[PDB]
């Protein structure tokens, strides 16, 4: 509590280990979260810590056995309230209703961009916004996937993820004339959404591995694409594109 | 963003010449690049285009045959040229980058063509 | 080919006067794919507008252009000196592009 040594631990933490053993051959653990103390059977940072807090919730850290996740839960005097699963590195992701069920969840990227779901309901459903550097997608969820949406006119893009996180994206113009409407195509492989008005292609759309969107126009002909990718930075870049 | 076009040029009927256009401040292969006549005391011309990168080349049908476009993807530069001149070339010659608009225009390059 | 007439060849106006210029096609413009350009003696041309109303980059709002299909229009709302100069209309809806024969706008006197 000096007689120890210190290990570093995922979520910014720290855990102190006994390099001697206790009173019944298990090493003690202490580490300040409110001070949480437990023992484990081994003298490295993996173990369980118990704690209450000054409003009688017991807290609860989980580290893990190779030091790669903590698992901060928070209970009532007995009922979760609190989940938090943070990682070595430093991807994170929850509370509670009444019966025991999720009620929302925040998926923090490695990144630092965020997937936060609220009011979710039994069935899986609820609200769903995506925070990327510089604007906010919104959309539902439901048990099936995660669909975030943006509008502007008649055109409507909708950015699908899946459970597993696969991004595919889909476009739909609810226009009629065969002059101005918007359809689009789908590469999963590039990750690309070309976009096509009056038999031309007039865009791509670019999803990258980095959480970010990248607009290229084709010319005026629909020939080549010119210039480079430019990357979006705001709300409004999106509906421009969509114009 | 910037077209850099080659000086003026006094030739006599029957000669070659090859002027260019080199740009700067963008990335040059990515965007077409145009040609664009201006007889003495006329209006304006299209001539042709090309997209540098894979020189994809494509002619107004009032000059395919009569002039080459190309471009030296390399050096940043598009080429316009002429194998024999005659007196009715003598003009100004713009090149500019086409969106298939004219947005960037070099300053011209004035070629005489006399005996 | 696709061409361009503009009307008329001269425009007379006065500084601070109302300008429109006429440049209509033979065909339907594709896209309204109409572009406008300013040239003045012993320079090159500057593209005004394109799209048939989308104002290039640091061109003054006081250039506007409207029109659709065959009939475009150029307007010069409140005409300053440096407006004075040669007006050309292009069309790349399609191939070939095309120019107008130009509009001239002098000082009324």
């Known amino acids: 509590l000096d007689n120890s040594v210190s290990v570093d631990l995922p979520g910014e933490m720290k855990v102190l280990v006994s390099k001697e053993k206790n009173k019944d051959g298990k090493y003690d653990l202490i580490a300040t979260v409110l001070e949480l103390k437990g023992t484990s059977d081994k003298n490295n940072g993996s173990g369980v810590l118990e704690g209450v807090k000054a409003d009688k919730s017991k807290v609860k850290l989980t580290i893990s056995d190779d030091l790669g996740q903590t698992t901060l839960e928070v209970f009532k005097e007995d009922t979760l309230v609190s989940k938090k699963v943070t990682s070595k590195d430093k991807s994170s992701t929850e509370k509670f209703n009444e019966k025991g069920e999720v009620s929302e969840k925040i998926i923090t990227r490695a990144d630092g961009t965020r997937l936060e779901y609220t009011g979710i309901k039994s069935d899986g459903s609820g609200k769903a916004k995506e925070v990327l550097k510089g604007y906010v997608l919104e959309g539902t969820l439901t048990a099936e996937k995660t669909t975030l949406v943006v509008k502007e006119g008649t055109v409507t893009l909708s950015k699908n993820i899946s459970k597993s996180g696969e991004v595919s994206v889909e476009l739909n113009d609810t226009d009629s004339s065969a002059a101005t409407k918007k359809t689009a195509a789908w590469n999963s492989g590039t990750s690309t959404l070309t976009i096509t008005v009056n038999s031309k292609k007039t865009k791509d759309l670019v999803f990258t591995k980095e959480n970010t969107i990248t607009v290229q126009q084709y010319d005026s002909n629909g020939t080549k694409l010119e210039g480079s990718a430019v990357e979006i930075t705001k709300l409004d870049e999106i509906k421009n594109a969509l114009k | 963003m910037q077209l850099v076009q080659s000086g003026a040029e006094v030739k006599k009927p029957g000669e070659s010449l090859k002027i260019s256009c080199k740009g700067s401040?963008?990335?040059?292969?990515?965007?077409?690049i145009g040609w664009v006549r201006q007889m003495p005391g006329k209006g304006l011309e299209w001539m042709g285009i090309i997209y540098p990168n894979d020189s994809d080349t494509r002619y107004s049908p009032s000059f395919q045959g009569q002039v080459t476009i190309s471009a030296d993807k390399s050096i940043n530069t598009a080429y316009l040229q002429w194998s024999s001149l005659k007196a009715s070339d003598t003009a100004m010659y713009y090149c500019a980058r086409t969106r298939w608009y004219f947005d960037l225009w070099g300053r011209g390059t004035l070629v005489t063509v006399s005996s | 080919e696709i061409v361009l007439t503009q009307s008329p060849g001269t425009l007379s106006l006065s500084p601070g006067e109302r300008a429109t210029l006429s440049c209509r096609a033979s065909q339907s413009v594709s896209s309204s794919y109409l572009a406008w350009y300013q040239q003045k003696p012993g320079q090159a041309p500057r593209l005004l507008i394109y799209?048939?109303?989308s104002r290039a980059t640091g061109i003054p709002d006081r250039f506007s252009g409207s029109g659709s299909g065959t009939d475009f229009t150029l307007t010069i709302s409140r005409l300053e000196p440096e407006d004075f100069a040669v007006y050309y209309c292009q069309q790349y809806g399609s191939s070939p592009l095309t120019f107008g024969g130009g509009t001239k706008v002098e000082i009324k006197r």
């Open positions: 401040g963008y990335i040059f292969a990515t965007y077409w």
């Open positions: 799209g048939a109303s």
